Every structure is written in C-alpha cells, then in structure tokens.
C-alpha cells in the first residue's frame, strides 16, 4: 500500500488504471505520477503514458484486467494505435460501441469475475466476456449503479461502501468469490474506485488516505508478504 497524488489531487483512480499485466498513467501533466508508478512496477509490467480521446480520466474511461483492455467509442484511432504499440502482444485491445462510455465506471473487473452496471447492453456484455474472459454479473453496489467507481477489485480482496448492509456484504462476496470489506478511502470519500487502484500484489491510494484506511486495504489485500 502506497500513497500517491496525481498533480495535487487525491483521486488517482480517476487519472490512472492499474491491472496485473500493465499500468496506464495520464499524459501531459506531471510525470511525477509516472515516476512513482515506474518506481514500483517498472521492472514488473509495462507502464503506458496514454490518453483516451485527448483526455486524462483514462482510469475511469477504460476498464481492463491482466488479459484484455477496453476503450470507449470516443477513443481516437491514433491513441488506439499508440496503446497497441505500447502494450505487449499477449494483451488484446478492444473498442466498445457502448452508450455508457465510462467503462471504468460501469465495469469493475478482476482477472476472473466482473460485476457490471445493471443496464449494460447485451452486445457490450458479450464482448466483455469474449475479451476479458471473465464471468459477467449485473448487480448494483449499495443500491448504486456505478460499480467500477464505487468498488475496487483485486484477485485476493475488494472494497465497497460503508453504507452497504451485512447481508449485501455477504451476497456480494458470495457472487464474487473473493473477500470483501466495507470501507472508505481518502479520509471518508465513498468513491473507492476513484481513490484506489490495486493489482494482485501492490496497492496505490491517495496521499490523504488515513493510516487506518491503509491498514484496512493492506489487511484485505494481504500485501505484507
């Protein structure tokens, strides 16, 4: 568990997306964010200094896992070509003709199971299962539709709202086959996805995250070893 700030913002999930096979960072701002990501994942997975549609919210615009990556309709051809050249061959990239352009807000996906916005298109769901090779389930998180923004997923742990009930907690854990904890990030902000990006072996949160919150994320993600 590490603390980082993009520019002077506590939301690093918005400006970056992290998987178990690659990292994506925003372009045009301060590369200190790219510098921090390279300091921990430079020797493990490639780090791509990319934008999506001339935009820096790539974290909440693109959802992906260790296998595949998705981009929205507004993704330019040049940027898509840039992403393909940067990423290694065993990783596949896919454009999505989805009405809900914010893929990072409508899809929360780990390497094996993904939980999606309830009103996603059938064609989007089919191509998600084809590219991501994960089981896709339509459900809301704490009565809230933005699963990708309001829930963070990893292979060994996950987080949701503190507003969720215990029975919702148990049901979500049972449907995801991964330990799940009700918590908060960045000192009381209930946007877990926007404030946290996690791979299977490291975690990044905003610099305003409390020590208690970092301990919670470390405890659920078993990152001490």
């Amino acid at each position: 568990a590490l603390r980082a700030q993009f520019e002077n913002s506590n939301e690093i999930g918005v400006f970056s997306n992290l998987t178990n096979s690659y990292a994506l960072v925003a372009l045009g701002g301060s590369e200190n964010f790219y510098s921090v990501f390279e300091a921990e994942l430079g020797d493990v997975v490639p780090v791509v200094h990319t934008t999506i549609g001339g935009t820096r919210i790539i974290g909440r615009l693109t959802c992906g896992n260790r296998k595949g990556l998705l981009v929205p309709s507004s993704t330019t051809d040049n940027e898509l070509q840039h992403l393909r050249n940067s990423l290694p061959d065993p990783v596949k990239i896919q454009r999505v003709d989805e009405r809900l352009s914010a893929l990072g807000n409508i899809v929360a996906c780990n390497d094996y199971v993904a939980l999606v916005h309830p009103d996603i298109e059938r064609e989007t769901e089919e191509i998600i299962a084809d590219v991501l090779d994960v089981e896709v389930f339509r459900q809301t998180v704490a009565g809230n539709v933005l699963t990708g923004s309001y829930c963070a997923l990893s292979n060994q742990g996950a987080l949701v709202h503190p507003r969720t009930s215990i029975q919702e907690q148990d049901e979500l854990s049972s449907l995801l086959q991964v330990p799940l904890v009700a918590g908060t990030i960045n000192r009381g902000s209930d946007v877990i996805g926007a404030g946290l990006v996690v791979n299977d072996w490291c975690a990044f949160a905003g610099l305003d995250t409390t020590a208690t919150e970092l301990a919670v994320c470390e405890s659920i993600f078993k990152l001490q070893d």
Binding site: T76, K92, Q94, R95, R99, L100
Partner: protein, 114 residues
C-alpha cells in the same frame, strides 16, 4: 484524425467541417455542412431526400455490394501493431482499391444507361 461519414448525406466529414450533435441517449451525429444539419433539425428522412447517398443506395441507384479485393473497408476495433511492410503494401492496396472501384463504377453506370 478520422475522416468520418455524415449521418445525412453519407459523405466525407473532414476536420473542422461541419457540426457534431450529442443526443440524450449519448448518440453522436456528425453533419458535414449547414444544409444537412438544418435538414436534420427539420427531421427530413434521408431515405426520402433525393440528394443523399443513403437514398441512392437504398433506392437501387447505387451498387448492392462491392467485395472489391476480398476486402474493401471496415471499422476495425482491434488495433494492429505497426509494421512497414504491412504499412507499405497496404498503401498500395489503397490505390488498387481505387482503380478497381473506379472501373466497376464505370461498368455499373454503363449498365444502368441501357
């Protein structure tokens, strides 16, 4: 940098030219010029407006299909890694599209003349 296709006339839309309209269902329409934009505002059906390629192709006035060169064009949603040999011989395939499509364009209208 994409030379899109207009919703109304089905013609090319270069950068700078035309209007982009986003509807509440997040659908994006591109209009090449003010004529097509205002016609869209009055909601005139392209299939019933004479001067549109959409009408011409849907009324039998344009080719049914042109499987030119075993492949003609597509909206590829899977990007392909950059290669010179691929990039140069596909530069040539571009042209080879053009003469073949130009040839069939002459033949079709000659057939339609009689």
């Amino acid at each position: 940098m994409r030379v899109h296709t207009c919703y109304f006339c089905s013609g090319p839309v270069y950068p700078g030219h035309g209007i982009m309209f986003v509807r509440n269902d997040s659908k994006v329409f591109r209009f090449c010029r003010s004529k097509c934009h205002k016609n869209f505002k009055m909601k005139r059906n392209p299939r019933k407006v004479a001067w549109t390629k959409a009408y011409r192709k849907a009324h039998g006035k344009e080719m049914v299909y042109d499987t030119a060169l075993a492949v003609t064009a597509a909206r590829r949603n899977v990007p392909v890694r950059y290669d010179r040999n691929v990039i140069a011989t596909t530069l040539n395939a571009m042209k080879r599209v053009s003469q073949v499509h130009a040839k069939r364009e002459r033949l079709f209208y000659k057939k339609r003349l009689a």
